Known about the structure:
This is part of a larger assembly, with chains A, B, C and D. By secondary structure, chain B is of the alpha+beta class. Chain B has six helices and ten strands. In chain B, the strands form two sheets. In chain B, strands 2, 4, 5, 8, 9 and 10 form a six-stranded mixed β-sheet that branches. The longest helix of chain B is centred in the N-terminal third of the chain and has 21 residues, at 21-41. Chain C starts with 7 loop residues before the first helix and ends with a helix. Helices cover 53% and strands 10% of the residues of chain C. In chain C, helix 3 (30-43) packs parallel to helix 5 (69-81), helix 10 (177-201) packs antiparallel against helix 12 (228-254) and helix 15 (305-323) runs antiparallel to helix 16. Chain C is globular and about 100 Å long. By secondary structure, chain C is α+β, with helices and mostly antiparallel strands. At the A-C interface, helix 4, helix 7, helix 16, helix 18 and helix 21 of A face helix 8, helix 9, helix 10, helix 11 and helix 12 of C. Chain A: It is a single-pass membrane protein. Chain A: It comes from Homo sapiens (Human).
Amino acid sequence: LQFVSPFAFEAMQKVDVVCLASLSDPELRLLLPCLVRMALCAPADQSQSWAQDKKLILRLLSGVEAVNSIVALLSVDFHALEQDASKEQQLRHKLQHGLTLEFEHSDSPRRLRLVLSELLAIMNKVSESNGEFFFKSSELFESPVYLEEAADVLCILQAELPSLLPIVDVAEALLHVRNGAWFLCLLVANVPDSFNEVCRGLIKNGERQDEESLGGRRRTDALRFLCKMNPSQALKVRGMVVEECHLPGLGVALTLDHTKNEACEDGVSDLVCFVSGLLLGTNAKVRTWFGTFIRNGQQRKRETSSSVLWQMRRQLLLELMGILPGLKEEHVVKASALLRLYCALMGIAGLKPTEEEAEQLLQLMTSRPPATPAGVRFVSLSFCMLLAFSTLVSTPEQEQLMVVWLSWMIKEEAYFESTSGVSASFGEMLLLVAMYFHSNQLSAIIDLVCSTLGMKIVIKPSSLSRMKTIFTQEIFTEQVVTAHAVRVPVTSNLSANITGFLPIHCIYQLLRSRSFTKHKVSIKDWIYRQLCETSTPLHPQLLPLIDVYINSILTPASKSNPEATNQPVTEQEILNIFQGQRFSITAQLLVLYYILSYEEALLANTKTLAAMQRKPKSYSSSLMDQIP
Amino acid sequence: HMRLQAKALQLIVTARTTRGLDPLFGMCEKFLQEVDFFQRYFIADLPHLQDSFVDKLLDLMPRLMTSKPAEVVKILQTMLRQSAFLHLPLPEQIHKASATIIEPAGESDNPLRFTSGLVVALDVDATLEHVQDPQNTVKVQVLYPDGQAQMIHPKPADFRNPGPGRHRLITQVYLSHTAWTEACQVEVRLLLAYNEGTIPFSKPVKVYIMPKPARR
Amino acid sequence: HSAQDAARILMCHCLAAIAMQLPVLGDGMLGDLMELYKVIGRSATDKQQELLVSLATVIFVASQKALSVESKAVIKQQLESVSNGWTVYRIARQASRMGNHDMAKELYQSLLTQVASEHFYFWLNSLKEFSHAEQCLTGLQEENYSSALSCIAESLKFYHKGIASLTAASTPLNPLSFQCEFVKLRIDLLQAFSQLICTCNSLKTSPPPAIATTIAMTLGNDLQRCGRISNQMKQSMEEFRSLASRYGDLYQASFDADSATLRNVELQQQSCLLISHAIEALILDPESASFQEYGSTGTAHADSEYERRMMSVYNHVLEEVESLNRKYTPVSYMHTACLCNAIIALLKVPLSFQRYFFQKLQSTSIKLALSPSPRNPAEPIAVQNNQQLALKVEGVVQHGSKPGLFRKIQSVCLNVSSTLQSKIDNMTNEMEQRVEPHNDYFSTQFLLNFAILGTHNITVESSVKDANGIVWKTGPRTTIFVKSLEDPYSQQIRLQQ
Amino acid sequence: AHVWEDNWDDDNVEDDFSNQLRAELEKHGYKM
Lengths: 628, 216, 497, 32
């Protein structure tokens, strides 16, 4: 069978007579009835340009005897045919030869009556079927010899009986008809302006979440034929699909057809953009409906390569093949977008990935990005991706792979921050998840992972227990996380407005643990820089932090090891703060709090200091009377 | 005069929004009828109104009888755009009425409790200041929180007159409804009716009401 | 000419205002501002970004018409010489504001090729696609319907790509609700235009012949000069009116924009209603129409040259339809030509991307926490159905900044109704109450009465009404499930009844 | 009052979203 070409359809829609002259014989044979209706019938427009258009329509109408066939068909009396149709409709509400043979031998009025009876019977059968898909067989409509003239007669019926034959009901009846996809393509080719109405009626009568039904498959194929014959409005059809929340496999088919039409390797593909917008968009019903679609495609255990799900999965895999090289510079944002889409796939839509998909996922995890803020974002999402789905790594090969990768990361934590310029959000979330693992704050682990991902999924606590066994033994020890914490830069412009879980909370908990003085790590530089950079209002952790700090300066960590002692802030630094303007107001308020608590704690707890015999530098009277 | 001007502006706006030529005709007929009622009632003071909207419109009145409503509202629009501003002669030491409910206080969180369908009598004690015809004008309005307004008239023995032009309203208001799940707030306000419509001139008070179901 | 590169930013802002009022001031002296632009690079060292942004804004205002390729190449030369990405992004945003979509497309392409993050990338990409589609729309020829619909199809393909990438950029935080909804309504407007011009072209597809074949041409039974085309005109009129209703909905749900953006949305709804009235008063019954624009129109009190241009187009369409109201029979000989002319003018005026589509201010919100019996899950709340039900709704208003930037909240009209969850849809209780928040917290008690066995859904609305008094339908519109069971003694008595 | 009221170009007026974009894109600081 030959479908109507898009060039022919745009020529018909734009009514360009030179274009219609440029089209060749078979498409004009397909498009005869409307053109001869144009050339014979009384014109609504009487303009002279339309007169030249009409004589050129005659010029191209040279050479066809089906013109005379349509002449006879128009000569049949439509009022009598209509009233007989109405009476037969009322009766239905209340031939030895085959149908093709009767169509052939019987004259044009009997032909019209028989095709009208078949269409009306199919319409009534659908209307009593009430959306239940059936199959209706007619040898006239299934005889490949007589398809052309049969479709011409159907076009004449549609053009002659608007009220008796609603075009949307005709479209549904022909959807039930076996060759009615080709028939409807010819119908919309003859009547171009009803294309949107036809597509709307099809998707309104379509099913919600079944692409495996026969009727759903036929509707999908018909709309695919329509979008193939009109590629310009294919994305519009996709738009109404998204609006009406029907036929998601059909929407995927449109997306794949358009990404086959357009080859733009510079940007992110419209497939990735469209699926990401559906899965991560604000429309809850669309997200749930598409998730149900992915669930059905996943639970479909049959490996059918013509499935649109396997099609778009393969297209995504090939796009990842194009992305994956050392990682290139400009590919990083595209890779991160693909990662977010994949997380949308297995997290909220529950697509189980196969072993090669998982291997490529681990390769993309362990890919080394350049030292950019984009690379920082990429590695943050990658670490959260693996933490979210530790199920991706199964074999010891990928186990030692991600161990080596994470070892490389913890060697390049502050290096990445220093090269980027932005504070290490990745390093600080590493610090947070480190003490979350140590104190078994798995709920906080889950919440931080979801917040980093920007989308809510549920994650397995036993999988996080396995990752805890990986994480807390050889990757992160007490001294390792201590060094990591002291090399984390401070939270810039710290206040109570910036909410969350903070490195200041981490440092406070560590100093409660006294691990800094246990592993001999200087903390006064970190405290000094954070408090010098702090502004107003006040984050409520600062005062207990400073009190624990001053208690750690005086009281040693261990009885057996009295030497465990943090060095206090130097009076030269206190002068540099109190020069005043260079600093804030909250900074020297906290510094005054620290020094006064220092003096009071020295003159209160002097018994332990006497037992220690390491009396620290009591501050000078010059410092005391330079402080206002 | 100002009320006529208001009706004219409302007619102009409905003319802007309305497509029906016969609704326009009806509104025009009623508006001109009200203008005729105004001039018939106030034959006088037409010399007192100089360069006035109403008197210039009375001069142009027969052409409005002749003409279609479209040009009627067009001329009325321009006419009232550059019509006038009238002087308002200030009278002697007049006062505006003021109603203040001193009882119930309404700050009580202790609800008033009864059984379903039965009525509770709530005293209303208010001071009215500078009201003429108080027993016929001052009426009580109670809003039940299911949204309905009950209008209670006081009997004319409830209007004590201790002094000149200052009255006290002491009355009963009968509140009943079906049972409620929790206590709610019933609105009590003093409406002033004329002769045709009502005007609130008191601060509303909220009273906590809670009906219980039957005990057995 | 005579300035020392400090006051130039200030007078550039000022002359931008003056040319924003009167358009001729830019195309009068296009050249000298480009000369100052070319001397910028070796003229400035300290606020290069600021004066670059200002003078690029005014070069767009000056070249409100189609921008010269040489001029934009010089602009790109200086920007690629010395600029911040944030700088050139602000030039791009001003280009989107004025309407120079080709330059906008180029700048969005460069910023897209850099970016760093994901929603940022998708946001820039969507902006790029709308700029490209608007470039295609500006590439239009007068009185050529086939080329016009081809350009429409191309631009609609590019909005489809852009709106997909915009939904990709959408996040639970900073959700682009206004942006997505406004661009979707623009898409639907252009789809309606394409469908209307398609039916206009198919007017000559023997519809009068179908009418004359079905019924007598003289004294037509379906209509006087009846037509399936007239039926499609009725469909288009109803669709356009629905689109105008959606625009009114978008505006009244936005409520947060400034005067320029709210005015611009009003103009888009104006265009939609113009097409609706044109197709209603010309194709449909003109005697029943009988409408003449006997009112003041064409005053230059507008706040934008864009607004003036749409207003002039409106005056042109009104005068043409008022001339052609009674000339022809309903066969629509040149009525289709008049409609096509209106469409071509309305698409020749390009667009104006606006501030609330961009940076948003005065972000006000209503929390609107109801406090019934607390339904932590979606379990419905049992009521005895004999007494009543109380609601105890509560709302607290929050402001992202200085609350009174444009509109100060005055009163909150809460609106509560019921619905029968188990299938007149329980539309009996249609309450609304106008609570005035004295402070930023308020509560109000509602009583619901129902004696129905099935589950019900209860819906509330905020209806924030401002100082001068507007509807402004914003707010959460949350819903609560309520169960309804009855006394066993009551059921036994009813069974005995 | 300021010189021009419809000024999209001002620092403290602009909101959180393209403040974050400003942070990123000032960090970037170039176009090809």
